[PDB]
Design a protein around this nucleic acid. Structure first.
Ligand code: ZN
Ligand code: ZN
Lengths: 83, 93, 148, 99, 85, 109, 94, 108, 82, 99
DNA sequence: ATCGGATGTATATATCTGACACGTGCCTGGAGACTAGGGAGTAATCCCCTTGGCGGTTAAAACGCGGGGGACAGCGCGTACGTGCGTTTAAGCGGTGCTAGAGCTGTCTACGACCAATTGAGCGGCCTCGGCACCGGGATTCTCGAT
DNA sequence: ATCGAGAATCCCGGTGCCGAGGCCGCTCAATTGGTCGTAGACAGCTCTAGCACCGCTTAAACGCACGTACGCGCTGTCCCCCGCGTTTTAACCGCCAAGGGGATTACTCCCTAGTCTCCAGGCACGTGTCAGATATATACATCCGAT
């Protein structure tokens, strides 16, 4: 049950909406691939630590507290999901 | 089962002192609990480091005062120090 | 396979070039258990001293060092009552390229000059280091008890 | 004859619309699939609490919004209004994310 | 010009070279031996005893451990011996 | 004080003092813990909570609402100066962003 | 005589003479090495205690330190440091 | 390993195991400390120290010097990817900066 | 009482710092901005240093206080102990 | 008749000279006076170890060098060679120091 | 400078639903009294190193000048991006079913803390010689105006 | 495309000095032996929620066409940093002199940890009702072409 090339699920309209919230009025056509690459890098960095945290506790389910701990470790505290 | 604790009731009491007619949802309550826990960890860790630097083995009230001065910005730190000193003075007598 | 192929040519190399004052061979059915004999070096208080030793080869070779031990008795800062050798080549800085001839010669080299810095037994090292001249009599004595 | 707006006004309208709301701008099933793909690239046969995926989505969207603010500032600094990949690269380098 | 089989032996294996790795000290050894020595013994070359940890870290990420030139020269000359393994 | 009431009420606080004392004792911070640290810490925490709740209540009132949601907390934190510096790296879930548009992008007169 | 102060000077010098037998080290470089060792010790031993408080344990074992090494060191340093630590522990036990 | 030898040489290390055990047992980290944790932590510290010292010695030799100075330490650290990432928020006193000139500024 | 000592950071010194930073051309309005940012940084660090000194009941700002203040801000310094 | 270097070829020489050395580029007495002035602004009747002043100088110089590197990149982004205060402002904003 | 559509956003009213605020049982954690001991407060002495001053010498800073190159404004081209519409896709919702794994309870056994005796690893102080700094002279190499 | 003159940098050889490497004495902290209370490892059982599938709307995504306005290159001007020479300022070095306060030691007392008993505060669970979201219909602000 392997999943392949799902990064295309972050479509161009979604990136445009994120830019609109960020305050961008006009967007170049090469922004979308760069945004996909940056998002993939960030997700890999967070999920590696989340999986390490869930592996230390001898579990098979990645809880929300593992994600919160990883985000706090990387320097991006998140309020709302525990802690 | 098991019991899990939180600062929810005290946050609600403070809110009722401040705004007697407003309420608070559940997500906001969770955010407030996270904030209180985070500030607790910050101040306690700074106080621990302060006590370790001076070759002490105790966390007294002046440790917490210095930690509050180091963490919080200017006016926030001033008001927090005033409130903590007032609470300690009312407690000791 | 790998380990046995290494040991066969190690034995062949030892046989075709017999090391001076050291001999070795297989005593058991297999080549994992070996016996060896070492003669005392000329510039040592171990004149005319024969020492027997037994060695076991671990299952993974040469990536793990072999185990050596003394069946006979000798007094040494690096050798205990059981006869185990305290040599950095044997335990810590072992390189897989090292052959049995090199380690068996380093044993005799250590016999020439004991290493007191990291002794297995401390009091024997103290007795050796405090003065060599006083102990040299006991060194020959220990040779007559076992080596001679 | 048909009515149409000059290019730029609808963009400002979208900016005002999406800065007043607080929902999530990425569809949830594709993001969940991407998270699961990366995780199974790390360790096989993993399970995810729904709160974990929700937290990951919140964090990623906040990060992208902040990065786009910095990118907009970088683009404006060069006497432009469009944001280009060099703006993203410069913002990331100055932030120390890639150096 | 063409190297012989004498210089095509692994110091630890005493067999034919497979997936050669050439350390900065110009000590060539087969890949399984390098992996085993790195994992278990010293994180150093078995021959002249110099540290190659930084080189290993640099070349493992970029997949450049194997010596391409020597492997290309060797693989064409002795297909049968490589097949025997 | 009277040495008869509860510790929280003896110091005039609403946040707990016994729970804070236990948390400071069992947190692996120091070998010993004084008897005035929990009161001081509870006072500081209560002051900060009261400040943020006051600002969030004001933000909710400006929106014709009688319930603080994460949006009002985000507005209260970001629209301040010391609270924004104290919580610079903190992400508030369902908080949104402060509305602003750069002056260059607005249409020319 | 002044009060005794502790440092990693002799151990760092032994390591240096192991890697570079003919190279010495000055005093400021030694003071930088001592600070580096202290900083990494604090980092690992402090992030390996949150790892035990998270799981409601009370003992720091070689399983918390291994995971702290995994989390704190970068991609290729955390594969060699973990191997060296495991090798040292195995050599210590047997 | 056999007993009757010092703890640091039983594990094949150079950094002290008793001192690391005491520091772990006195720094307010946890209520109890396992037996194998000091060995692991000392091994990691010694590995990192040797890792930096090798590159520092190489940089010192490239300058025809026989003594490591902070300049050689920073030349070693900042030219290695993992070491630079590990110490990226750290200032080394009397170390300077790497030679780096933007290609636009060079004459045409 | 010392006053107006920010001018000891001369224009040649700022030029040397820029040259080490890799700068080829420098505009004439950059020196006041550099003085301002340097003053802000110094105030921020020295406030924490003096706080650390005062907590220890001392009257001298040792190097340990400076090292701790720098570390607290995310600017760890190697070389002066710690 | 007298020999002159074209504008730009003495700046690169200084760049290469000062990137090859490790000394401190600010005079010590003026910096010490400034440090003492700020400290006496904070708390009166203060004394300073010489190591503290040296550490402050090292930290300040490292910070300024990093800031000037970022400023140079910002200036190069806008297709310039000269650095201007807006470059410093943008670099500090993106790094989060001034926001 | 408006004037008219035309479109989008704002404003007022019915309604209904699910989450928030409150009430109840109880049990586990916090409060109260008592004892023992070591941590920290206070006083006194030592001597280190911080502050202040003077004279010289000279490296670094300050000031002025001539000019070339870079910053900035203005024009023109065309090409990529914004807006709008019709069509295809799969997200979202509701509902059901199954079981894997998180979570809790009971035993008990081995690992880690604590204490006493002891001695060698490591720290402080001294000493000496070689590695590196410095001076002076020559060779090598960019740099620029002129062809 | 180049040749040559003036200037900056690199090599090489000789002299000197101070700090890094090693030795000696000593004291205190790490080691070894022994005992004990409990932390967690293992086995068993509960049951919650994570995973998978199905069908129906319909909302968001996609693809295409037209036009426009913004990015990008080119030219011109001017003025402002840069390189260089001359003069002035004060930094740096060596030296002496005083005393504040950092650091250590000894004594003591009182604040905090640990133990036992007890009881009420807050946590889990259940319930009712009203605050806000949704649908519907007007009212007004704003944008664009055209005078
Ligand atoms: Zn091999
Ligand atoms: Zn080698």
């Amino acid at each position: 049950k392997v999943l392949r090339d799902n990064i295309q699920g972050i479509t161009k309209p979604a990136i445009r909406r994120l830019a609109r919230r960020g305050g961008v009025k006009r967007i170049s056509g090469l922004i979308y691939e760069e945004t996909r690459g940056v998002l993939k890098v960030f997700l890999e960095n967070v999920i590696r630590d989340a999986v390490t945290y869930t592996e230390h506790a001898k579990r098979k389910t990645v809880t929300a507290m593992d994600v919160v701990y990883a985000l706090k470790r990387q320097g991006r505290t998140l309020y709302g999901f525990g802690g | 089962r098991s019991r899990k604790e939180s600062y929810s009731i005290y946050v609600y009491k403070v809110l009722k002192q401040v705004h007697p007619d407003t309420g608070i949802s559940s997500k906001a309550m969770g955010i407030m609990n996270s904030f209180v826990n985070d500030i607790f960890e910050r101040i306690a860790g700074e106080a621990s480091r302060l006590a370790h630097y001076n070759k002490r083995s105790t966390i007294t009230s002046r440790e917490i005062q210095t930690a509050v001065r180091l963490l919080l910005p200017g006016e926030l730190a001033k008001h927090a120090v005033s409130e903590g000193t007032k609470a300690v003075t009312k407690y000791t007598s | 396979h790998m380990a046995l192929k290494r040991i066969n040519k190690e034995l062949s190399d030892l046989a075709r070039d017999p090391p001076a004052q050291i001999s070795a061979g297989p005593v058991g059915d297999d080549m994992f258990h070996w016996q060896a004999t070492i003669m005392g070096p000329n510039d040592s208080p171990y004149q005319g001293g024969v020492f027997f030793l037994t060695i076991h080869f671990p299952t993974d070779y040469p990536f793990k060092p072999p185990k050596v031990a003394f069946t006979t008795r000798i007094y040494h800062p690096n050798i205990n009552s059981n006869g185990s050798i305290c040599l950095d080549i044997l335990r810590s800085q072992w390189s897989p390229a090292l052959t049995i001839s090199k380690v068996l010669l380093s044993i005799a080299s250590l016999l020439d000059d004991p290493n007191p810095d990291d002794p297995k037994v401390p009091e024997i090292a103290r007795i050796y280091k405090t003065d060599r001249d006083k102990y040299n009599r006991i060194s020959r004595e220990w040779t007559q008890k076992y080596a001679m | 004859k048909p009515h149409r707006y000059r290019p730029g006004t609808v963009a400002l309208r979208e900016i005002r619309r999406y800065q007043k709301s607080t929902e999530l701008l990425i569809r949830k099933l594709p993001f969940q699939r991407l998270v699961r793909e990366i995780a199974q690239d790390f360790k096989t046969d993993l399970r995810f609490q729904s709160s974990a995926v929700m937290a990951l989505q919140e964090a990623c969207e906040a990060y992208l919004v902040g990065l786009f603010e910095d990118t907009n500032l970088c683009a404006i600094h060069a006497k432009r209004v469009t944001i280009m990949p060099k703006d993203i690269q410069l913002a990331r380098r100055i932030r120390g994310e890639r150096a | 010009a063409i190297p012989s089989l004498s210089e095509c032996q692994c110091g630890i294996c005493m067999e034919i070279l497979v997936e050669p790795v050439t350390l900065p000290c110009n000590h060539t050894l087969c890949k399984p031996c390098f992996q085993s020595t790195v994992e278990k013994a010293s994180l150093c070359c078995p021959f002249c005893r110099r540290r190659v940890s930084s080189w290993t870290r640099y070349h493992t990420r970029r997949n450049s451990l194997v010596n391409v030139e020597l492997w290309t020269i060797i693989q064409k000359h002795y297909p049968r011996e490589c097949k025997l393994r | 004080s009277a040495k008869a009431c509860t510790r929280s009420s003896r110091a005039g606080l609403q946040f707990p003092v016994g729970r804070v004392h236990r948390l400071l004792r069992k947190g692996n911070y120091s070998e010993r813990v004084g008897a005035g640290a929990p009161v001081y810490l509870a006072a500081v925490l209560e002051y900060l909570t009261a400040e943020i709740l006051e600002l969030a209540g004001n933000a909710a009132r400006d929106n014709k609402k009688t319930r603080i949601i994460p949006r009002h907390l985000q507005l209260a934190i970001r629209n301040d100066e010391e609270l924004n510096k104290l919580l610079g790296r903190v992400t508030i879930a369902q908080g949104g962003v402060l509305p602003n548009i750069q002056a260059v992008l607005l249409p020319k007169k």
